[PDB]
Design a protein around this ligand. Sequence first.
Ligand SMILES: *[C@H](O)[C@H](Cc1ccc[nH]c1=O)NC(=O)[C@H](CC1CCCCC1)NC(=O)c1cc2ccccc2[nH]1
Ligand SMILES: *[C@H](O)[C@H](Cc1ccc[nH]c1=O)NC(=O)[C@H](CC1CCCCC1)NC(=O)c1cc2ccccc2[nH]1
Ligand code: NA
Lengths: 303, 302
Amino acid sequence: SGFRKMAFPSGKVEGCMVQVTCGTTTLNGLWLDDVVYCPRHVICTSEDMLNPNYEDLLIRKSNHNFLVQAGNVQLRVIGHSMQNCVLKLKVDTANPKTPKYKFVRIQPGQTFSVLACYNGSPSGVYQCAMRPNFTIKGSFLNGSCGSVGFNIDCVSFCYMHHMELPTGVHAGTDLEGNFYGPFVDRQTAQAAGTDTTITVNVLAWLYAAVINGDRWFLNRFTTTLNDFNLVAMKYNYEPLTQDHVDILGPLSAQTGIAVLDMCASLKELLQNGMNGRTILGSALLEDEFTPFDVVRQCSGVTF
Amino acid sequence: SGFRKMAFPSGKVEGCMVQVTCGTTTLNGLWLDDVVYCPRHVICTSEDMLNPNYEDLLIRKSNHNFLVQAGNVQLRVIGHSMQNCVLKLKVDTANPKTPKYKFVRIQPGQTFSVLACYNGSPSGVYQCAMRPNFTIKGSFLNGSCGSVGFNIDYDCVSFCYMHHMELPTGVHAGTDLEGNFYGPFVDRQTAQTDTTITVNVLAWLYAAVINGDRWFLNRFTTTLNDFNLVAMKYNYEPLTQDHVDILGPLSAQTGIAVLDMCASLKELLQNGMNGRTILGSALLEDEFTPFDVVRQCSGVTF
Ligand SMILES: *[C@H](O)[C@H](Cc1ccc[nH]c1=O)NC(=O)[C@H](CC1CCCCC1)NC(=O)c1cc2ccccc2[nH]1
Ligand SMILES: *[C@H](O)[C@H](Cc1ccc[nH]c1=O)NC(=O)[C@H](CC1CCCCC1)NC(=O)c1cc2ccccc2[nH]1
Ligand code: NA
C-alpha cells in the first residue's frame, strides 16, 4: 500500500548521457548507437541567441568544433546535421550501453521521467506530465539542456529540454526536434497558454485512492458524460472523452466503481471542495498520474 | 528553476539487485561483492511466523534452499549467516557491478531514495523521509521486501534502509544494512505517534523563495521560544539552535534570517494558506532536508 510519485529506474538512460561543448556552451547530449542528439542552440554564441539563423550558423561549424565527452573519453565527431531543433552528431563509436529504444511524441496529459543532468552527469530523477499547455513543470537549471524525458515499456524517449519560460515552467522538443507547443528556440520571453487540469488523470488517481482504501469522497450519484463536462469546464478541467472512459475501464472493473459514477464524485469535489480533507495525503486533486501509472504502481509492474 | 521531489539516479543500485527465493517466498536481495543481503524473514514458513527462532531455522536450511537469480544467471550459494535481522548469502561470484558503497544508519528526519523492486527487478524510484516515529510512508506491495533505500555522494552509495514489512496503517518498516530495525519493530507476525519535521518545512519554504514563490513571506520576526510555543501546538518538532545553524546556508543564500522565516511559518500554521499553494502544494511539506534543497537548487551531480 501507499502511493508515491514514482519515476522509472534511470540506469538505462544514465548510460546514454554525454557532455557536448561548442564554444562557451556546454550542455548534455543523448548518445544512442553512433549518434549524439542535443539541442541545436548549442551552436549559438550569446549574440546569436537573440535571432539565430541556425542553418547558416551550422554551415560555419565543422565536426571538430563539437567537443563530445562520455565520462573521461572524448568521442570523435565525424558528421553533423540538424533535424528541426535537435542537432545530430555522428560519432565514430557506437555507445555500448545503448538500450533497445524508440523515439515517441507524447500527448498532453501523458507522464514521463526526467533524468536531470549537468555536464553529462545525472543530478536526479523525477516524474513529469506534459501539461495541456505543452509545458512541463520540471526542475531545470542553466546547464540542464539536453536532459531527456522517457518511459520504459524498450526505452521510449519523448522529451529533450531546451529552455525555461517566464513562469518558471519548461519547454522542449521530442527527439525529432519538434517543440511541444508554440515555442521557438530564440532568446525572447514567450508566454505559455492558460493551463488546465488533466481530468482523466485525476480520475485515475481517485481510483488509486480507492484501491488504497481512501474512499470518503465516493457519493451515491451518477452523471452523464455531458453533464460532467459542463461542470469540468467551469473549473478549468480538460474535457473527458469516451476514449478516456474506455481507458479507465480496467480500473473501474478492479474497484467496482463505474467511470461515470466516479465522475459524479469528482463533480461533487469540484463543486463543494475538499473541506480540509486529504486524498492519498494530498490536499489538492492530483493530475500527474495516468491510468497506466496507477496500474503500474498498484500492481508492481517491473522492468 | 522549479522544485521537485527528486530521487537520486538509481543505476548504481539497479546493478546490485537480485531475486532471492526460499521455499515459496520470493523477495529481493542486494548483491555486493560476494554477498547477497536480504531480510531474514525469507526463511520463515507461515507457521514459523509468530515467534520464529531464526538461529534454529537458519541452521536447518541448506545453501541449496536459497535460489538467487541475477538476471538470467543463477548464483551458487556457498554459505548462509545472519547479522541481526539481515540474512547474508555468500555466493561464489563477486558482483562486477558493485559500486563504491557504505552502510549508514540514518537519523529521523533525514531523506533517501527507495528503489522499489519485485522479483529482483527495479520497478520505480522515489524519495522519502524517515519519519520521527521511525516508519516510512512508502509505496510497497507484497514482494518488495529487500528493496533498499540509499543516498549518493559523488561516486559512493550509502545504503541506509532495507524493506521488511508494512504496518496496519499502511506505512512501512525496515532495517539498516546491519540488520537493526529502525524503531521498536520486530520481524515476527504480531500487531505493532508521529510529528512534523520542522527544520525540513523551513528548508522547503527557503526552496520556495529560491524558486520565486514568495507570497507567504511577511515583515515580522519571532524569537525561537515564541516560535516553538506555536510549533508544539501544531505537532511540529521543537526547533533547536542546531537546526537554525543547519539552515545557515539557505538563510545566507536568500537573505532571510531563520527567525524571520519562522514568523512566516507561524502565520501559515495559525492562518492557513487562504486557498494558495507553495511549490504546487496545499500542505506544508517536510520531506526535504536543508541539504536536499541546496543539492537540487545548485545542480549537484553524481
Ligand atoms: C539550457 O541549459 C538552458 C536551460 C535553463 C536555463 C535557465 C533556467 N532554466 C533552464 O532550464 N536554456 C537556456 O538558458 C535558454 C537558451 C536559449 C534558448 C533559445 C535559443 C537560444 C538559447 N534560454 C532560456 O531558457 C531563456 C531565455 C529567455 C529570455 C526571456 C525570458 C525567459 C528566457 N528563458
Ligand atoms: C515482503 O515482500 C512483504 C512486504 C509487503 C507485504 C504486504 C504489503 N506491503 C509490503 O510492503 N512483507 C510481508 O509480507 C511481511 C512478512 C512478515 C514480516 C514479519 C516476519 C514474518 C513475515 N508481512 C507484513 O508486512 C504484514 C503482515 C500483516 C498482517 C496484518 C496487517 C499488516 C501486515 N503487514
Ligand atoms: Na517574516
